């Protein structure tokens, strides 16, 4: 049946291997908890500062 | 059918709690619930949200 099986080692989970391709608008100065990709943390909305 | 177990039987039909406290008892009884050509009385859920 031409089986294909991935690995998902997860020993390097804090990486940049997330690709859902989501475009969500973000607005800063608000108590929010969110995280795209993996870095063991959480951030604040709005991007493109420096 | 045990604490902290997965699978279609343990995820769609009957799942023990992680803090379960009791005995699990099982045996084989193909004598009393089978017939030539198969016994179709027993149905198990295979799909659920």
């Amino acid at each position: 049946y031409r089986v294909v099986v991935l690995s998902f080692e997860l020993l390097h989970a804090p990486a940049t291997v997330c690709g859902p391709k989501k475009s969500t608008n973000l607005v800063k100065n608000k108590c929010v908890n969110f995280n795209f990709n993996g870095l063991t943390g959480t951030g604040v909305l709005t991007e493109s500062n420096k | 059918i045990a604490p902290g177990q997965t699978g279609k039987i343990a995820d769609y039909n009957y799942k023990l709690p992680d803090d379960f406290t009791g005995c699990v008892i099982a045996w084989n009884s193909n004598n009393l619930d089978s017939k030539v050509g198969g016994n179709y009385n027993y149905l198990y859920r295979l799909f659920r949200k």
């Binding site: 997860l10 804090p14 063991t40 943390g41 | 604490p3 902290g4 992680d18």
Partner: protein, 49 residues
């Protein structure tokens, strides 16, 4: 200096594994299943305490 250094060495201890998979509760909760993560979360709890 003594007070500041003691406070800093208390805060810095959050990054140690204490014998667990990771030093972050979110990572260990997401990577590992609930019933098999308490055995590893409790070590981190004991270390922090």
């Amino acid at each position: 200096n003594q007070n500041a250094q003691a406070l800093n060495t208390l805060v810095k201890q959050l990054s140690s594994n204490f014998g667990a998979i990771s030093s972050v509760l979110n990572d260990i909760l997401s990577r590992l299943d609930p019933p098999e993560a308490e055995v590893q979360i409790d070590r981190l709890i004991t270390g922090r305490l």
